[PDB]
Amino acid sequence: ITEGEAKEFHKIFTSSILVFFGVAAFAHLLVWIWRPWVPGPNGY
Amino acid sequence: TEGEAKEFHKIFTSSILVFFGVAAFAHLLVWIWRPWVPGPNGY
Amino acid sequence: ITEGEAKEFHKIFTSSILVFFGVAAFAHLLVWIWRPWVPGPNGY
Amino acid sequence: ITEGEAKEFHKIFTSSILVFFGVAAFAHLLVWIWRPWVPGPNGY
Amino acid sequence: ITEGEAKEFHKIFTSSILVFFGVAAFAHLLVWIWRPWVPGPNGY
Amino acid sequence: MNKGDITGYMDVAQVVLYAFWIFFAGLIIYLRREDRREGYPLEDAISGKINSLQGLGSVFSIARPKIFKLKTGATYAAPNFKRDAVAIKATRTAPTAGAPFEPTGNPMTDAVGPAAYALRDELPDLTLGGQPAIVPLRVAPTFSVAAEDTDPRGLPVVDRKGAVAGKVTDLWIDRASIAIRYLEVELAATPGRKVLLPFAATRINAKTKSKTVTVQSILARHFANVPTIAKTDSITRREEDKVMAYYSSGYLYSDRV
Amino acid sequence: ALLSFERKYRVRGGTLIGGDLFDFWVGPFYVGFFGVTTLLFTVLGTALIVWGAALGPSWTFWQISINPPDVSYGLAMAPMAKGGLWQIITFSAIGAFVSWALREVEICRKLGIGYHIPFAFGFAILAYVSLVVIRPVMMGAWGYGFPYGFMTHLDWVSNTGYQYANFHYNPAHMLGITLFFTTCLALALHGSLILSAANPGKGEVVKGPEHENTYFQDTIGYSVGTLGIHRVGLILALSAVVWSIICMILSGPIYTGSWPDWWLWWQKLPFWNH
Amino acid sequence: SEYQNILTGVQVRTAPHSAPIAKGIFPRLGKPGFSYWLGKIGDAQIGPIYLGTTGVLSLVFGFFAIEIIGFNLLASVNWSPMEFGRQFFWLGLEPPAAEYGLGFAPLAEGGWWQIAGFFLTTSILLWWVRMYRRARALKMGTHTAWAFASAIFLFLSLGFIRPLLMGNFSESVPFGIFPHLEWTNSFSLNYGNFFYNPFHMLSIAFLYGSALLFAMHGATILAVSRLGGDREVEQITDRGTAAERAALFWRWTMGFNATMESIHRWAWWFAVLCTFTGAIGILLTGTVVDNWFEWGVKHGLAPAP
Amino acid sequence: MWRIWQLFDPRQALVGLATFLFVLALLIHFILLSTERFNWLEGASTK
Amino acid sequence: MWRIWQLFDPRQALVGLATFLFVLALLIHFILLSTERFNWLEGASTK
Amino acid sequence: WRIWQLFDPRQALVGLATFLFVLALLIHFILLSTERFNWLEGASTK
Amino acid sequence: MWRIWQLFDPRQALVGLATFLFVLALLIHFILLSTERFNWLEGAST
Amino acid sequence: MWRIWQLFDPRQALVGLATFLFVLALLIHFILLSTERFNWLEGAST
Amino acid sequence: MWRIWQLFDPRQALVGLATFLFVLALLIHFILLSTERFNWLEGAST
Amino acid sequence: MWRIWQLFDPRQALVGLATFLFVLALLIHFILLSTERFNWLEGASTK
Ligand SMILES: CCCCCCCCCCCCCC(=O)OC[C@H](COP(=O)(O)OCC(O)COP(=O)(O)OC[C@@H](COC(=O)CCCCCCCCCCCCC)OC(=O)CCCCCCCCCCCCC)OC(=O)CCCCCCCCCCCCC
Ligand code: 07D
Ligand code: 07D
Ligand code: 07D
Ligand SMILES: CC[C@H]1c2cc3[nH]c4c(c3C)C(=O)[C@H](C(=O)OC)c4c3nc(cc4[nH]c(cc(n2)[C@@H]1C)c(C(C)=O)c4C)[C@@H](C)[C@@H]3CCC(=O)OC/C=C(\C)CCC[C@H](C)CCC[C@H](C)CCCC(C)C
Ligand SMILES: CC[C@H]1c2cc3[nH]c4c(c3C)C(=O)[C@H](C(=O)OC)c4c3nc(cc4[nH]c(cc(n2)[C@@H]1C)c(C(C)=O)c4C)[C@@H](C)[C@@H]3CCC(=O)OC/C=C(\C)CCC[C@H](C)CCC[C@H](C)CCCC(C)C
Ligand SMILES: COC1=C(OC)C(=O)C(C/C=C(\C)CC/C=C(\C)CC/C=C(\C)CC/C=C(\C)CC/C=C(\C)CC/C=C(\C)CC/C=C(\C)CC/C=C(\C)CC/C=C(\C)CCC=C(C)C)=C(C)C1=O
Ligand SMILES: COC1=C(OC)C(=O)C(C/C=C(\C)CC/C=C(\C)CC/C=C(\C)CC/C=C(\C)CC/C=C(\C)CC/C=C(\C)CC/C=C(\C)CC/C=C(\C)CC/C=C(\C)CCC=C(C)C)=C(C)C1=O
Ligand SMILES: CCCCCCCC/C=C/CCCCCCCC(=O)O[C@H](COC(=O)CCCCCCCCCCCCCCC)COP(=O)(O)OC[C@@H](O)CO
Ligand SMILES: COC(C)(C)C/C=C/C(C)=C/C=C/C(C)=C/C=C/C(C)=C/C=C\C=C(C)\C=C\C=C(C)\C=C\C=C(C)\C=C\CC(C)(C)OC
Ligand SMILES: [Cl-]
Ligand SMILES: [Fe+3]
Structure with a gap:
């Protein structure tokens, strides 16, 4: 793997992981609005 | 080679500091939610 | 491992073990203040 | 198999399968007349 | 496999899936008329 | 209830169990005697004099030599009490009996460690018909590769670092066991030099159309030092051992040598 | 002391870890770093077993038994007197067996042979780890592990089998049994054939591969040959263990009922479910 | 690889x-x-x-x-x-x-x-x-026939010789898949748990030992198969490096070793003794020991109930 | 559709098809014999 | 999409596809026979 | 600076990542076994 | 004292020592979780 | 349809067909023996 | 992102996907059949 | 940071990562289905 190939892979990888984390972050937000997962002192 | 290892050290020392930083923030949030050292009467 | 490398290592190692023991000693002091671990005659 | 040899086999296959389906269709008709196999709302 | 041969197979394959899905869709329609398979709120 | 009793406490099932233990101890003695038909008596690690820690069972420890009769009319004795020379082309890293040896020179050519071999007979293994068992397909015209398989002949021979050692020019087959035992490789360097390659030290890679015999054991530079054989169409048991040991040493020594 | 052919093979190198420091022999035994850690775990676990015998009610060897904690502890570590001893012995035994496997690897490296033996021993380790770790973890309590005792582990086998009404009906157990019986059959045949070829009888010459193949062709119409039988004999033993592991991961973690009742799916197949 | x-x-x-x-x-x-x-x-x-x-x-x-x-x-x-x-x-x-x-x-x-x-x-x-x-x-x-004779001895003990000692066939084995398993279950329960029969314990040790030996030996011969180790009778009559390194792997691992011939005697005897000790355990059951757990209690296998 | 005999050997096709259709037919008749309504040999009534 | 046949041998593909579709069809009929509502041979009432 | 002169940087990453994941997974499962810290069951601090 | 690091290889020593210290530390935390008084997660009263 | 004997060997055909027909016939006679109505050897009444 | 098909063999990608997606789809349909609410063949009440 | 792809093969990295992430995803969905609060298929009340 050349420097240029590694840097090109890193570009595609960086975009893909950022998109994947972006979708997952929105998924967690929708789940949180429905039922949050941190209980209060009295529980849920 | 040593310079090649020295730039690895740059990436390492920075990447651990964010890892420990994220972990430290996570522990602080968990402590604010529920602390994990019990008093004499227990929790 | 050359003599200059062995002296270099020994300095770093000797500092590192003293830092490790120093952190551990403070951890044990904190735990002892929280709950000591030597029971009396009537227990805890 | 040549093109013509395939086309010749396809002729005999086509008549054979249509005869097989023709006998089977008549057998299913006779069985249906004896006892049909689609139940109404009340069952059988 | 040459392009013309692949395209010739794709032509017959395309015709076959349309017949197969057409027959299957007719089968599902008749079964739905006999007993539908999506239950209402009270169930079946 | 009295049913099984031999005495107040003793009973038949208990007696039969101790009779088994007596038999089994005797069987272990017999089996350990058989285990000592090669390699024994033990020797001192440094001097090579016959010495070991022994009890009074030493007197039953090693069996009388059994004689195997070979179809050539020769015989082999076990124990034969033949033993390897005390000197080897290596020296101890420390003077204690348990210390390891360090090779003095090139271990692959000096035949120490995994390059070492047994001084087998300078005779080929034979078919039941008395012909030599292991021979090139050139000389065994009734044999063939099964039509389902890749024939190795004409394929390049490639090391784990991707260097070409040569091309396969023949298969040596075992007439008695009906298997490929070696590939005969013509070397890329010093062209016309041919060496045997143990077939179990290879696999065929065919993920790419120009399929190839890959060799994990040794690198391309080591093929020029593969042990030679005296005849072009048969191989003695000693030559087989010498060749096979050389490749088996590659996993330890090929990045050293 | 050494065998008559041993010295030429006792070369330096092949260690996985620790370098030259451990690369030596004590009599016949090779040491290495995993020899040392083998001894560490072995002495610790053995002495803790003897300590458990001193704590327990009898020195009668057959009756000695170190027991897992009560199931009420779940997967927590128990107090030493209340099952924690079994937990320490268990992980020491894992350490000992893993060290034994890695020490065999070093010996393979030094001799230039393949790693088939420590690989095959890795299935013994996995079977032990399945019974004392994986199954009790999936069942949620260490108390499902077997007790360390000559008769009490057999009592645990009895109790565990009859918990599922009749363990003979577990289908994976049937296949495990079949492969164990087939392994012993194949071993009897293999030992016999080599001995019959090497020991043809007085006044007879030693027989070779053609005779070896011909005996099983004549008797049963097939011969697997001298290389195939070692492949088969290995695969049989390892498959018997794999199916044994499966039969126990099924029983409790996955299937909880009567094994005799499981088979009633067969009698309910629509082509004969009259 | x-x-x-x-x-x-x-x-x-x-x-x-x-x-x-x-x-x-x-x-x-x-x-x-x-x-x-x-x-x-x-x-x-x-x-x-x-x-x-x-x-x-x-x-x-x-x-x-x-x-x-x-x-x-x-x-x-x-x-x-x-x-x-x-x-x-x-x-x-x-x-x-x-x-x-x-x-x-x-x-x-x-x-x-x-x-x-x-x-x-x-x-x-x-x-x-x-x-x-x-x-x-x-x-x-004739080694194969004499190994087979041990398997037959268990088969005969199950089917005929124990019935001959008991005087009837009622506890002989039925011909049937689950029926012969059910016979195996009921036989253990009627005679007080076969785990406490020491000859069943011996028979198991040799059954486990057979799978142990074939795993060890099969892996060993494959480990030396790039040295000609699969040619075992040839190695028996002219010791090659394969037989030397097989011996030394086991010697260095566990302190002792076989020869290329004698490992097949270990193999032969373990598989034989599985069924031989099995047959003895069957022939002693009901004839001289009526309850194996009670025999075990007598001989210290278990505490008194 | 005759080009399918350029894809497949007629000898193999017919032997496979004969085997398939017989096993399928045998399965269907055995399913019917398991029913009360369609077991013709036992002839329960259509109540 | 005719380029699929430059990736996959149509002969192998049709054999695999026919085998898959038969096993799937056979599964779905056996599933329905297990139900009360859709077992046409037993024909339970739609109460 | 010098520890990478003593250890292979590839082995460092592979071992350390595997170690940290297994440790993290263990700690989350330990907390799930507690009443106080099982966030998915959410018992009250009575 | 530095001559020790020519006699024992720092690559081997630090790997062995780190492995040893982790296993020991893990053992001690699990022992404390076995107790009533020192199980910080359950947090019983004194 | 006679071309089927160019497609298949008569020797293989007759052995397969004879085997098939016997096993099919034997199956049907066993099925009937298991019935009440058609077991000719037991002869239940109608 | 087309470079991913130089990285991975397209024929293995499609065969892998088809295998994965069928097994996943079949799993999800069987999960739903294991529920009262979504088993469409049993069709329990809401 | 891109030099990590000199240190680790792009092909094995993506395959190993996708395998890791799928197993982790399945684990979390199955854990949630074991809970009363978050089993969406069962859908218990937040009492
Ligand atoms: C610290 C942790 C310790 C965990 C437990 C470990 C138990 C075993 C002990 C292991 C260490 C033994 C070390 C040893 O003996 O070294 C001798 C050697 C000097 O010897 P030498 O000069 O080279 O000469 C020796 C030679 O002449 C002897 O003859 P040979 O070469 O033909 O045979 C070699 C011996 C070596 O045996 C061993 O090392 C131990 C073998 C394994 C025993 C396992 C017993 C438990 C299992 C069940 C047994 C079952 C028996 C029946 O070979 C044999 O004796 C092999 C006999 C094999 C019998 C197999 C039977 C199989 C049946 C299976 C069950 C079937 C059930 C139906 O020593 C030296 O060079 C000096 C330095 C070492 C001094 C050692 C001091 C003592 C160490 C004791 C360790 C602590 C023990 C608690
Ligand atoms: C019987 C005539 C003669 C007699 C004087 C003698 C006495 C004793 N030997 Mg012995 N032995 C004799 C002959 C002989 N011997 C052995 C071997 C061994 C090895 C491993 C085999 C083993 O499992 O033994 C099994 C039993 C057999 C073979 C019978 C003799 C041993 C008995 C009855 C002692 C058993 C009691 C114990 C508490 C356990 C001992 C330790 C272990 C087995 C590890 C093992 C350490 C061992 C122990 C002892 C002891 C404790 C004594 C005592 C109490 O005097 N013997 C074999 C071996 O490989 O040796 C390196 C072998 O080849 C061979 C031969 C030919
Ligand atoms: C009422 C009881 C009921 C009854 C009906 C019944 C009957 C039968 N069953 Mg069974 N069984 C029952 C219950 C039941 N059943 C099994 C198992 C099996 C397996 C065992 C082999 C195996 O697994 O080896 C798995 C191998 C392991 C665990 C390897 C362990 C060894 C290692 C790591 C190394 C250890 C080394 C040292 C400590 C070193 C010491 C020091 C020195 C020597 C010096 C096998 C296939 C099998 C056979 C049969 C038969 C032949 C019968 C007959 C004839 O009726 N059964 C076990 C299993 O599958 O475990 C994974 C299991 O747990 C379990 C249960 C609970
Ligand atoms: C509730 C069940 C209970 C429970 C406590 C328990 C559990 C376990 N047990 Mg056991 N067992 C129980 C009962 C019980 N147990 C045995 C026997 C054993 C031995 C068999 C050795 C052999 O090779 O058999 C197998 C070999 C045979 C039977 C003899 C060779 C076979 C021959 C010649 C037949 C040749 C065949 C043809 C030519 C084909 C003809 C065709 C047709 C008929 C159609 C073996 C070692 C063994 C293993 C274990 C394990 C591993 C376990 C575990 C892990 O729990 N058990 C037999 C025996 O020898 O007992 C002493 C026997 O009789 C008997 C009984 C009644
Ligand atoms: C996987 C296929 C089969 C297999 C294979 C196999 N076993 C092997 C090997 C192989 C290939 C070896 O190379 C290795 C070996 O060296 O063989 C001589 C080994 C081995 N198989 C052994 C035994 C064994 N294998 C068994 C089974 C099997 N082994 C399978 C059937 C069994 C059974 C079923 O009961 C036993 C008892 C050993 C002889 C040996 C491994 C030796 C070893 O690990 O030594 C180091 C450890 C010690 C000396 C002792 C450690 C002590 C612990 C600290 C405590 C242990 C306590 C224990 C948990 C409880 C005991 C109480 C019992 C009553 C339950
Ligand atoms: C040492 C103990 C182990 C052992 C060993 C062992 N078994 C052995 C041997 C050995 C050493 C043999 O030599 C022998 C053998 O042949 O092995 C290949 C055998 C054997 N072990 C067997 C089985 C076996 N072994 C088992 C176990 C064991 N075997 C132990 C684990 C088990 C079980 C339950 O664990 C079984 C089932 C057999 C495969 C075989 C003995 C075969 C035998 O005796 O066959 C007798 C004949 C028949 C059953 C009849 C068949 C009839 C055909 C249907 C005829 C068809 C054609 C004919 C022309 C038709 C004619 C019609 C007309 C008469 C009208
Ligand atoms: C030096 O090297 C050597 C060789 O080379 C020189 C060798 O060659 C051999 C010899 C070894 C082999 C040829 C292969 C060994 C392999 C195994 C043991 C593993 C696999 C099992 C077998 C090959 C079967 C062994 C037994 C045989 C061949 C039969 C011997 C007896 C007869 C021919 C006569 C009587 C028996 C008959 C006719 C048939 C016996 C029954 C079977 C074989 C089983 C059939 C199956 C069933 C009944 C179904 C059971 C399962 C059911 C119902 C459920 C699941 C459904 C299924 C369909 C399975 C050795 C030892 C050797 O040392
Ligand atoms: C091709 O045919 C083949 C052959 O060949 C030709 C073969 O042969 C075989 C092999 C098979 C056989 C020979 C048949 C017999 C085998 C069986 C039936 C299988 C069952 C086996 C047994 C019953 C034997 C079991 C014995 C075992 C497992 C060995 C037990 C020994 C030990 C645990 C000691 C290990 C030693 C080590 C690690 C290092 C050296 C140590 C000592 C000698 C003693 C202790 C240490 C000291 C005194 C000092 C050092 C200590 C230190 C540094 C640590 C100190 C700190 C502490 C805490 C202790 C096969 C397979 C084969 O196919
Ligand atoms: C006389 C006055 C004193 C002066 C002389 C003092 C000095 C000399 C002493 C030497 C004895 C000690 C060394 C023993 C090892 C010496 C070698 C040896 O094997 O000796 C045998 C005893 O072995 C051994 O017990 C070795 C035993 C090793 C294992 C010991 C384990 C003990 C701890 C666990 C126990 C409970 C287990 C659980 C039981 C349920 C007895 O000979 P034996 O011919 O058969 O050898 C076979 C060979 O001759 C065949 O060639
Ligand atoms: C009364 O006086 C005399 C002298 C006769 C008394 C002596 C009797 C003797 C010597 C008796 C000996 C009995 C013995 C030794 C019995 C041993 C029995 C044992 C150990 C049996 C163990 C297991 C057996 C099993 C599991 C057998 C199962 C067999 C099955 C399922 C057979 C099925 C057969 C079929 C399906 C065949 C169908 C016909 C085919 C399909 C082959 O087509 C023709
Ligand atoms: Cl392979
Ligand atoms: Fe062998």
């Missing part, structure tokens, strides 16, 4: 051949075939099989036994092929009840079991004579 020698990548073919034997009444039967997948694991040749007078006898007796079983199983479901398949594992042919002793029971009340058992027994003993005589014809040792 190096080649692990588990499957034969390239396999060769030649004219099928086999070692000569003296002319008998029957030649070697069948045209030798070859299959590709058997050639990957082992030798490809689905060779001819020898028949001979003893082979005829064994197959005739054995066929009659298998027919008597199979016909009785199908009769027990009133000849229905659907209920035969539905019930197959649960079907069995039972021995006679105890009141018949060792005389002939009525056919429907275990007489067929007695005939099937006798014919199966005779067939197996004739197969032993076959395994013996095929070795002598090849001028080979």
